[PDB]
A paper describes a structure:
The apo structures of RuvC and YqgF from D. radiodurans (DrRuvC and DrYqgF, respectively) were determined by X-ray crystallography. To sum up, our study showed that DrRucC might act as a major HJR in D. radiodurans, while DrYqgF might play certain roles in RNA metabolism.
The refined DrRuvC model contains two monomer molecules in an asymmetric unit. The DrRuvC dimer structure superimposed well with the TtRuvC structure (the root-mean-square deviation [RMSD] value for 258 Cα atoms is 1.665 Å), EcRuvC structure (the RMSD value for 268 Cα atoms is 1.933 Å), and PaRuvC structure (the RMSD value for 280 Cα atoms is 2.111 Å), in agreement with their high conservations of amino acid sequences. Interestingly, the DrRuvC homodimer exhibits distinct asymmetry in residues 73 to 83 spanning the dimer interface, which is also observed in the TtRuvC apo structure. Although the crystal condition contains 0.2 M MgCl2, only weak metal ion density was observed in the DrRuvC structure. Replacement by alanine of the putative catalytic residues in DrRuvC (D7A, E67A, H139A, and D142A) abolished its HJR activity.
Author numbering:
A (entry chain B): 1 to 70, 72 to 111, 118 to 133, 135 to 155
B (entry chain A): 1 to 156
The structure:
């Protein structure tokens, strides 16, 4: 019933918490974590894991939904992959099962911003930020797919 | 003085521990961790983070040496590699242990002596420098090689 969606990244990390059924979803919480530029990789990784860990303990989600990985550049893919493993580790440390959905799949379940208005409508709020918006989108998308 | 060497991987994680300085060095510990492919990816990144944090907590390394990822031809592959690498880097930060990377160049350079990836010689010079009778596994041997390499770049 409660689900955490994560827009993964290193410079940005979008997190979104919603709760409810397939017909009805209650928005709980959303934020975009931005680790700044001039920190060593481990320091950035420490901030993302600490903050993520803090939110999984309190909100106690029952599922984590994560965006499937798409980018042709390899150094970027390695940097993005480091944040992805630290996110996958935090859930495992919390015991929260992690389901993966593709960008198209979330678009099916709800230049192009239609998606943003569908999440806003189903949670009855107002999202300026593009990263917290997709995380909520993934959280809503898990509810539809969930049996 | 005490250096942990890490050969990072998801299927295989070589960890090597060594204390001393450039002229002579003491062998403390080495192992190769594996994760079965039956586990989901998060379950594997937890085991390595767990066994790394364990060895990191007992032995309290002064520094960590890690094999540099200068492999650079597929984005899909670097992403898969990066997940393991980041869990390793986080355990070190969580332990407060500074991280130094060395290319395969420097390992062989600082061990064989003007070597050019003479892999069997590098292993050979690992057993001799640390007085180890048997070093079978290449990941633990590589991780042992990296620890000696930071010891060669030692500041004093
Ligand atoms: Mg290797």
């Amino acid at each position: 019933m409660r689900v955490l969606g994560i827009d993964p990244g290193l410079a940005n990390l979008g997190l979104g918490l919603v709760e409810g059924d397939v017909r009805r979803a209650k928005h709980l919480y959303h934020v975009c974590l931005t680790t700044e530029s001039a920190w060593l990789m481990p320091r950035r990784l420490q901030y993302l894991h600490e903050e993520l860990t803090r939110l999984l303990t309190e909100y106690r989600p029952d599922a984590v939904a994560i965006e499937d990985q798409i980018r042709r550049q390899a150094d970027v893919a390695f940097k993005v992959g480091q944040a992805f493993g630290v996110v996958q580790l935090a859930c495992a440390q919390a015991g929260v099962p992690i389901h993966a959905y593709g960008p198209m799949q979330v678009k099916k379940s709800l230049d192009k911003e239609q998606v943003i208005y569908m999440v806003k409508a189903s949670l009855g709020i107002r999202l300026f930020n593009n990263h917290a918006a997709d995380a909520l989108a993934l959280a809503l998308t898990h509810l539809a797919h969930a049996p």
